[PDB]
Design a binder for this molecule. Sequence first.
Ligand SMILES: [Co+2]
Ligand SMILES: [Co+2]
Lengths: 388, 388, 510, 72, 167
Amino acid sequence: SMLGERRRGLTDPEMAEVILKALPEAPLDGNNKMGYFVTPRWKRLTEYEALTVYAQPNADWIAGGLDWGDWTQKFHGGRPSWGNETTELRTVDWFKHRDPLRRWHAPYVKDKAEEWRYTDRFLQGYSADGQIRAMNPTWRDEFINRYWGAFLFNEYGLFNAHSQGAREALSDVTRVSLAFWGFDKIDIAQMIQLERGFLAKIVPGFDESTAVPKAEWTNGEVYKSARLAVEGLWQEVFDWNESAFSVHAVYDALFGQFVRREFFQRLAPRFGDNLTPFFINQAQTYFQIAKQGVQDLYYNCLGDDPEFSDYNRTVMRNWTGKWLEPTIAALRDFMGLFAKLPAGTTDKEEITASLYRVVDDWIEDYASRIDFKADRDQIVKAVLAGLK
Amino acid sequence: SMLGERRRGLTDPEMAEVILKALPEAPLDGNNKMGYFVTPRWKRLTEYEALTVYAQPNADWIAGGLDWGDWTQKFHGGRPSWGNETTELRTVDWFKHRDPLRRWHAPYVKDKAEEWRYTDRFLQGYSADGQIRAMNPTWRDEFINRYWGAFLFNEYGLFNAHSQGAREALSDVTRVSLAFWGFDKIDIAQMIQLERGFLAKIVPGFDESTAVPKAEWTNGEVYKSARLAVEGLWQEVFDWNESAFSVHAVYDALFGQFVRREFFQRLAPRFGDNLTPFFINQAQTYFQIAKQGVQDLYYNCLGDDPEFSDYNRTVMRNWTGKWLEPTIAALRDFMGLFAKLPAGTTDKEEITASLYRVVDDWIEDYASRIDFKADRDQIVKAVLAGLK
Amino acid sequence: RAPTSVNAQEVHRWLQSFNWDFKNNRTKYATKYKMANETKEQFKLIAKEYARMEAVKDERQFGSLQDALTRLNAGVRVHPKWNETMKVVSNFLEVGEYNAIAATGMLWDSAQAAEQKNGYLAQVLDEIRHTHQCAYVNYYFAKNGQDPAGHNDARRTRTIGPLWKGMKRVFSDGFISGDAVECSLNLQLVGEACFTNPLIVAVTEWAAANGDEITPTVFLSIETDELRHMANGYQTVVSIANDPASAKYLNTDLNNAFWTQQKYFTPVLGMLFEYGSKFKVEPWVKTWDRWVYEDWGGIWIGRLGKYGVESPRSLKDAKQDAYWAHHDLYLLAYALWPTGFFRLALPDQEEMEWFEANYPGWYDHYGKIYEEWRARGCEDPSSGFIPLMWFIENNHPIYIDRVSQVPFCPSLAKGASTLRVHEYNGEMHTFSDQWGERMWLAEPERYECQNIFEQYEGRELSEVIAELHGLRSDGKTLIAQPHVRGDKLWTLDDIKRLNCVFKNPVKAFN
Amino acid sequence: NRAPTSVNAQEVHRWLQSFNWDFKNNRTKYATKYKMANETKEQFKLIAKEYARMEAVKDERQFGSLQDALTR
Amino acid sequence: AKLGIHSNDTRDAWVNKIAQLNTLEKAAEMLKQFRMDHTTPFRNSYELDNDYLWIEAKLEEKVAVLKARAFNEVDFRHKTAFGEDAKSVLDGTVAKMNAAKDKWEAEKIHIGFRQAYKPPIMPVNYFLDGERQLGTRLMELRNLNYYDTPLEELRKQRGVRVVHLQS
Ligand SMILES: [Co+2]
Ligand SMILES: [Co+2]
């Protein structure tokens, strides 16, 4: 029928009057601010904070928890649903972390959605504008298809490295940040394949199969150490903070940045490739967004913890040393790719200069924050040994 | 108060009861589709058409109008609010046009808003990522600032050429498209300045003032014929259709496309500049968006008018010729810019290939639609006759 | 040179190939099962497209909430009882959503096929959205509602009461502690499929009937995502069906999961629905039988028979103890009203008729009891009476099930009246059924949750409430109330005057 | 430093006035008895992008309420 | 006195006690003792039932801080707070678990492993790798023919003292 059979209490005269009659003359409490008991990071409590902080039902025995008592059901053997035992790092309060971009779910999918729709528009405009005509065939068919492609597996592995953290993170703010860092990594892997699928639609004979870039990843030399490092970071690390920290503040900060920014972003334009840089732009935006969260959690909150600052820095310095070597090996093997380029593309000086940019950025944004004594020239020298 | 003093018919028991009592048992007409009488361009009528077609109160004496009688108030002298006398082109129905992208206000601002927010995110990532470190200092301080900047006035002038069309358009569907074509143009001009404003923030010494780029536009030599072409299309043309057609199917399709796509979008990447291309990606996405609209109006509707096809093609071929000259002149003057480029940037072989791309895309996308006999070789030859 | 692009499906076509082999490529969690690495997922999504479809839903949802609904004063024009019910409904569901984030992160880790990992990944992201959505409902009612207390701090005031403990078992620890597959069962195969999804729809129904258009707006949106979550539960079973271990353990983990979920929701949902509303939608009895017995334990569970799945062996008992479950529990929840973060009301005259009508015998048992508590002045702050006292006077001890955390009073209950008391290595343990007892006997170390009587033992009631911040902004009036009227609200002092001191009922045993 | 940096509408609008240049036919195409000063300022310092965004936000709520709650 | 859920005399008493643990060996030994005395269904006593979880965490914080200061980087990653080789301990325990004849034997192995090596005693990476392997075996043994033993017999197997029954 036009009116329907279901009567609603907000509009149904009879029911609404019943409801209105039972109502108080005014609210039974003037404090209408959900999450008012949360210590605000900024001037005033944010929606991000209100909707997120303390969602995790931790008891006081897990630093910062407001509940009490043991979990109702634990693992066979006795392991707690969440516990201090899942990470070496300690803190006065696991709920102190704040994503500087204040991303709760709504804002997060909103921005990515905008990026998705614009990407589609960009591609339709790119194809319709025939800009592919000026792209060097060799750069396109060998470096984008094979080498940029193989990098999707690196990003895919870093994505998977986050699986355990999604399960073990000791707070809501940290779980949400981690989830988003991981989600952005798989997005990039998918955007690399997206570009390959696109090229296959506008370039006759371009095979979008992942077989070639996957064989490069699993059996080539250029990415051998990178893959070895990724397999370790992902499956050999059972500590959710060692995983996130080592991925974002060591491996991806050095190797990741070098490959994306100092190789592809830097060289693609030289071969008439404005296509790959469109996607790398997204990756770097994501990288810089995650960096703010990574720094807030590991340096602002943990490395600067009023009670465990010294302890956490010792641990993180430990992790940095542990993962720096595998990361250098990864960069060293990657140096082999430069020999595959057409003569005159770049030279040792440019490569070295670009290595230093990555290393210097890493020392300023990460190493120095925990007093890790990194020697810029020693690191670069070790990597350069890989130049074939 | 908690309940407020205002009583609402939808929720107030007393008022709602009265309202429900007056309601019929079922709708008084089963035809619940607004714009049902509109002739669908596609399979089923779209929201775009429903909300747009026939909003303009034209009477039957203006091809397509559904109203009757003269206008209630006219200009001193007798000129009608809207009349056949404002354009040389004739048609069986001015409401035939359909933006292929079906853009009414909502979708339009949604897309540009996504582009705006992503642009902001991009800039924050770009700066934080220090990608400016690898950009050629001369390209930035001379070609981006002065020459790219000066181009903003070209786009700006093209934006303004749409002012009269905004007033004289003979239908809603045409008025909306026109408004969007012009708005995208000023957007581009503002994006050019945005970049210069961005550079000024991350590159000390960089002056965002329009003084330099303006003087180049007003008194320079590179864009002289370009500016002359603009001033004429804008302030010397009084036929709204000639203006739209000449600006989009002639001038901007040749000169504009060359400058944006074949010069900056093509060369910026060679100087480690992925910044400018980020903005040209927009300008080109927009250009390609507008093109579908321009093609549907002048070719699909007017050029192929079941009764004035022949007549309109004549008028457009006439316009094509009238403006093909000032355009070529604009292109010749632009050639002088290559001479200012550092040695080795590009060779005459590449340029000839770029010109033919523009000229050929133009013939395929515009000139051939109205049976305009263009000579690719003669045009390219004429333009090239202006190199260093 | 025609406008071309790439969609999600076109990229997803190659997603299964993203994973590669290496010696240590294996789940980090303990499990009796092996998920096939060839397992596929139902929805061919990629991160970008997932975000877009969810953003579109948010748009409509927040648009309604912030504009039309706010203009209509929808946050206020809701029945008082229901404003209280949603404090519990929205916040308790929130933790379920939250723990499902970790739970699915664990399943993502368990899965070896890239597509199956991807399926779980989308749920991880969805449960984050749902957490924020449930948070938003409490957030909205606190900001624009008739009583913000409880809605504004449930995340900490929920810790005072016994009802919260059981919620954590089925929607927190049950979702993440144990064999990944066992967790999947509690979460997807049983939790969402049998109760959550049906519950979500039902809640929007009861909400609309009580003037609440806020919850329908959010929950109906949550519901659109749960369709995909079902496929994750189904694919879990599929990914392990061909593994010999499956025949050995699947039905046991499933049966345990079913009992776990049922044990808490059978009584709690019915209680919030029938006692937390003015306008009723349907008797819990028939709703339960349709959900659990008809739709789930018959239709849904049956379709999985081809994978070895059988109907829960404990399904019969579940049905037997179901009938009076929620009624037995409200007596306890109301008797312990000072420990909640919401206001409760005695059934009114009209309601007792509905109850007696839909549950022959209700009046002679519960009806009379409430009338006496009413007579004793349970609603009046000057009465110096709390229903708990009545239980003490009439020697009706309230115990807490060591496993499920569900409170029970076997000496009064009309439903299950079984009580098992064991002493083990210096500690007493109380169970209310043979399934939970079995769980504890076989897995003592999994169930060590201390109950409210153990923690509050020897503590004066007002001190516990004050310590755990169970007060309103005035710092004197209690959040919880024995009535939903706007006047004569109990204060901490009214409670202190009662001099109620908790004691652990199991200590009576020798 | 590499601090996250961007540019807003006001920052671009500041130079909007200079976007127009002097020339030949630079005048209205419509009959009028008045002369609008070419130095006139506008109150809202907007650019196409920001305009689009502020309106998109309003559309969001509006259509959201219409298609969802109001229809329900 | 001073009672309370989150703050009480017992907790204060342990904070003072912990404050005097200033060498790794002494602190680590006390944490291990604490776990034997107050955790799991096999704890030596239930006297600290309401505060042990919290006190254990505070004890853990101290052992961790002391270990980080005393151990070189290699040992912090690979040795237990007691100087044992983490891998050896892990492998040996897993080997023991795989030899377990039944679920009763297996539960003792798993539970005792936790009591003795829970971080910060054993490095987190090895401990959770242990949880992974030991938990799998424990569950495999326990979930086999789960309902075959009647409650009357299971109570006897668990060895509980049936205090009161009613039905
Ligand atoms: Co959910
Ligand atoms: Co779900």
